[PDB]
Design a protein around this ligand. Structure first.
Ligand code: HEM
Ligand code: HEM
Ligand SMILES: Nc1ccc(Cl)cc1-c1cn[nH]n1
Ligand SMILES: Nc1ccc(Cl)cc1-c1cn[nH]n1
Ligand SMILES: Nc1ccc(Cl)cc1-c1cn[nH]n1
Ligand SMILES: Nc1ccc(Cl)cc1-c1cn[nH]n1
Lengths: 371, 372
C-alpha cells in the first residue's frame, strides 16, 4: 500500500532531489556552505539578508522535501551558531514564514527531523552502482569534520537493510488470515534475517563516526528547543506565530522502521503512560504523515504474537522469537554505541540510559522462550 | 465501514448494552448499583475494602467485559473521591484494583472511568418498542442523588448518535472521490452537514436535564482523574498491580472517536502542532476502545477530501464542504456557551481562563479550514 514505502529503500525517499529551482538559489547557497558561513561568522548575517521567498514554486513532493531539508539545516545553524552557547531565540521572518508554510503543507513540525537529515539527505556517487557507503554522499552538513556523512549514511544503510523486511509484512497478515502455516513461518524467519543483517550494517558506524566529533559538534546542531534550558520558552517563528513554540530535536525514534517491528510483534512500546511510551508516541508526530499511517494501521491488524501463542507450534514460536531476539541484539548493540559516543565523552544525563534499557527490557520480556 | 464496531443505527455507541453481570459478580454489582446511598451514608469505602478479590475469567463476551469496566470504574471513582468533599483515597484496594487493571489490559483501555464506559455502555431503553429518545431512556449507573448524571450522560449519547448517522456516509465520500463522481460527493457532503446540524439541535436539550451547580459541584468531581491533579500529584496506586502510582486523565468527550472523526475526515489538523489542544486530543485517543482509534487511523490513511475539493474549481463542492466545517464551528461555539454556564459562572460562586482559550484554539482551527 502507498504509505510512501519504497520496496528497495523503505521509508527513505528514493533518490532525493539535489537542486531546487533557480528561484531558491539564496536558500541553496546558505545550505550548501553552512560549514564555511558558520566558520567565518557570516551565516546569521546571510540569513537576515534573505528576502521572503514563496514556497509556491516548490511543485512536486521531492522538491518540497529538499526545501524542508535546506530550511531545516539553515534554521539549526542560525539558532545554534558556532555551537558554544551563542544562541538566537527568534527565527527571522523571511525564513521562519516559508519554513512554517512548507512544514504545515507536509504535516511536519518546523524543525529539522530524522526524515529530513537522513531519509532526504543522500545521493549516489555513481547512479549505476549499488547503495553502499562508498557510493554515497550526504547533501548537507553543519561543520567540517562533524561526521554528519558517517552518522546520517550509516543510519540510512541500517534503515534500508531493515526495509527489505517490510515488504514481507503483508505476507504475515495474509498468512494469518488464510491460515497458511508454512507461509507464515517463512515470512518470520525472513524478517529476522533482515533485522540480523541490519545489525551487521550497524557495525560500520565505528569506521565513519568519531566520538569527539559527534558529542561536541554534531549533537549540538541536532538539538531542539523543547525542555532545553538554552531556549527555555522555545523558538519564536517570527511572522508565523506570536509566541515561541517548543519542538523536540532529531532522534531515530522519528524513524518508523524502528517502531514498526515492535508493533508488528506485539511488543507494547507505546502502551501505558510511562516516559518511554510517551516519548515514542510523541516522536510519531515527527514522522511524515504516510509513516504515521503505516504505524497505526499495523496496530489495527490482528496480533502476530497472539496468533503464534495459540498454535502449539515450536517452529512458529522459534521464528517469532528469532525476530524478537534480533531487536534485542540491535538495542543491546545500540547501548554499546551510546556508551561510546555519549557516555564516555560526557566524562571528559542517565535518563537516557534508563530509557534505552526500558525499551530493551520491554523487548526481551516479549520473548516466548529463552530465559 | 469495516469491523470498527460501527453500529449503523447508534454509531459508536454500544448497541443495547448488558445490564446484569454473572451472579459470580453480585458483590461488585450491589456496590455499583447503590453508590448514591452507600456514599452518602458513609458505607462505601468500608464495603470496597472488605471485598473479596474476584476473578475476570468468568466474563466471556465483549458486552460483559464492558459492563464490568463500567462497574469497577464507577466504584473506583466513588472510592477515590468519597463524598466528593476533598477527602481523597490515594490507594485503590488490591481486591478491586487488580481485577480492574487486568480487565483494563484485556480491553486495551486505561484503568480509569472513560467516555466509552459511562456514556457508550451506560444506557438502556425503557420500552424496547419505542425509539431512542431521552424520555424513553435511562442510564445504568449514577454517583449521587441529584448529580444530573442521567441528563449529562444521555444528552452526550444522543448527540453522538445523531452525529454517527453521518458515519455511514463516509464510505460514499471516498468512493465518490475515487470514481470521480462529483454529484455523489456533493450529495454525501451535504448529508454529513445535515447530521452535524441535527446533532447541534439535540445538544440543545442539555439545559433541560443538567443544572449548573449540580454539575459543577457534584458530577464534575466524580469524573475527575489523577493526571496533573493536585489532589493526587503522583496519581493513584493500583495496589498489587503496579508498585508505583500511575497518572491517568479524567473522562472526556474527546475520548469519543465520533467527536474527532469529522476533523480527520475534513482535514482539520487538530492534533497537528505542539500546542496544548493538539496534545490533549492525541492523548485522549489512547483512552478510546481499540476499534475506535483504528477507525480514526483508517480515516487518516485516506486521500484528503479537502485537497480533492480545493482542486476542482467547483463552487458547489466547496460550499458543501464549508457546510460541514460550519456545522463543526457551530457545535463548538454553542459548546463554549455551555462551558460558560456550567463551569465558569458556577466557579465564580465558590485561573481557568486557559480553559476557554483551549476550546477557542480548537474552534479557531475549525474556522480556519473554511474554503471561502
Ligand atoms: C553516535 C551514535 C548514536 C547515539 C549517540 C545515539 C543516541 C541515542 C539516544 C541518546 C537515544 C535515547 C532517546 C533520545 O534521548 O533521543 C537513542 C534512541 C534510539 N536510537 Fe540512537 N544513537 C546513535 C545511533 C543510532 C543509530 C545509527 C540508529 C539506527 C540506525 C539508532 C536508533 C535508535 C532508536 C530506534 C532509538 C529509539 C529507542 C529504541 O527504539 O530502541 N541509534 N539513541
Ligand atoms: C455541562 C456541560 C459540559 C461542560 C461543562 C463541558 C466542558 C468541557 C471542557 C472543560 C472541555 C475541555 C477539555 C477538558 O478539560 O476536558 C471540553 C471539551 C470537549 N467537549 Fe465538553 N462539556 C460539556 C458538555 C459537552 C457535551 C454534551 C458534549 C457532546 C458532544 C461535549 C463535547 C466536547 C468535546 C468533543 C470536547 C473536545 C474539544 C473539541 O473537540 O472541541 N461537551 N468540554
Ligand atoms: N541516526 C540518527 C540520524 C539523524 C538524527 Cl536527527 C538522529 C539520529 C539518532 C539515532 N539515535 N538517536 N538519534
Ligand atoms: N529499534 C530498532 C528497530 C529496528 C532496527 Cl533495524 C533498529 C532498531 C534500533 C537501533 N538502535 N536501537 N534500536
Ligand atoms: N459529554 C461527556 C460525557 C462523559 C464524560 Cl466522562 C465527559 C464528557 C465531556 C463533555 N465535555 N468534555 N467531556
Ligand atoms: N468536536 C465535535 C465533533 C462532532 C460533534 Cl457532533 C460535536 C463536537 C463537539 C461538541 N462540543 N465540542 N465539540
Amino acid at each position: 500500500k502507498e504509505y510512501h514505502i519504497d520496496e528497495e529503500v523503505g521509508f527513505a525517499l528514493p533518490n532525493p532531489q539535489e537542486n531546487l529551482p533557480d528561484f531558491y538559489n539564496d536558500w541553496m547557497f546558505i545550505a550548501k556552505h553552512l560549514p564555511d558561513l558558520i566558520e567565518s561568522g557570516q551565516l546569521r548575517e546571510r540569513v537576515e539578508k534573505l528576502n521572503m521567498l514563496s514556497i509556491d514554486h516548490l511543485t512536486d513532493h521531492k522538491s518540497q522535501r529538499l526545501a524542508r531539508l535546506v530550511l531545516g539545516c539553515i534554521t539549526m545553524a542560525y539558532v545554534w551558531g558556532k555551537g558554544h552557547g551563542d544562541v538566537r531565540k527568534v527565527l527571522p521572518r523571511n525564513i521562519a514564514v516559508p519554513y512554517c508554510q512548507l512544514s504545515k503543507k507536509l504535516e511536519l513540525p518546523p524543525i529539522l527531523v530524522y526524515a529530513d537529515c537522513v531519509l532526504a539527505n543522500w545521493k549516489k556517487k555513481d547512479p549505476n552502482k549499488p547503495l553502499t557507503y562508498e557510493n554515497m554522499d550526504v547533501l548537507f552538513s553543519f561543520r567540517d569534520g562533524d561526521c554528519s556523512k558517517g552518522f546520517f549514511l550509516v543510519s540510512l544503510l541500517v534503515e534500508i537493510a531493515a526495509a527489505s523486511a517490510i515488504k514481507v509484512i503483508p505476507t504475515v497478515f495474509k498468512a494469518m488470515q488464510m491460515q497458511e502455516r508454512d507461509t507464515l513461518l517463512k515470512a518470520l524467519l525472513e524478517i529476522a534475517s533482515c533485522l540480523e543483517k541490519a545489525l551487521q550494517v550497524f557495525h560500520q558506524i565505528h569506521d565513519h563516526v568519531n566520538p569527539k566529533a559527534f558529542f561536541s559538534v554534531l549533537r549540538i546542531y541536532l538539538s531542539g528547543w523543547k525542555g532545553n534550558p538554552q531556549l527555555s520558552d522555545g523558538l519564536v517563528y517570527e511572522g508565523f506565530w506570536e509566541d515561541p513554540k517548543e519542538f523536540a530535536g532529531g532522534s531515530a525514534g522519528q524513524s518508523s522502521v524502528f517502531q514498526c517491528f515492535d508493533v508488528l510483534l506485539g511488543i507494547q512500546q507505546t502502551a501505558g503512560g510511562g516516559h518511554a511510551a510517551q516519548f515514542l508516541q510523541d516522536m510519531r508526530r515527527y514522522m511524515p504523515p504516510a509513516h504515521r499511517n503505516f504505524l497505526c494501521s499495523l496496530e489495527s491488524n490482528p496480533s502476530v504474537r497472539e496468533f503464534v501463542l495459540s498454535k502449539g507450534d515450536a517452529g512458529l514460536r522459534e521464528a517469532y522469537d528469532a525476530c524478537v531476539k534480533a531487536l534485542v541484539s540491535l538495542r543491546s548493540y545500540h547501548l554499546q554505541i551510546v556508551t561510546k559516543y555519549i557516555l564516555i565523552p560526557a566524562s571528559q544525563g542517565t535518563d537516557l540510559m534508563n530509557f534505552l534499557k526500558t525499551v530493551r527490557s520491554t523487548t526481551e520480556k516479549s520473548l516466548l522462550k529463552e530465559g
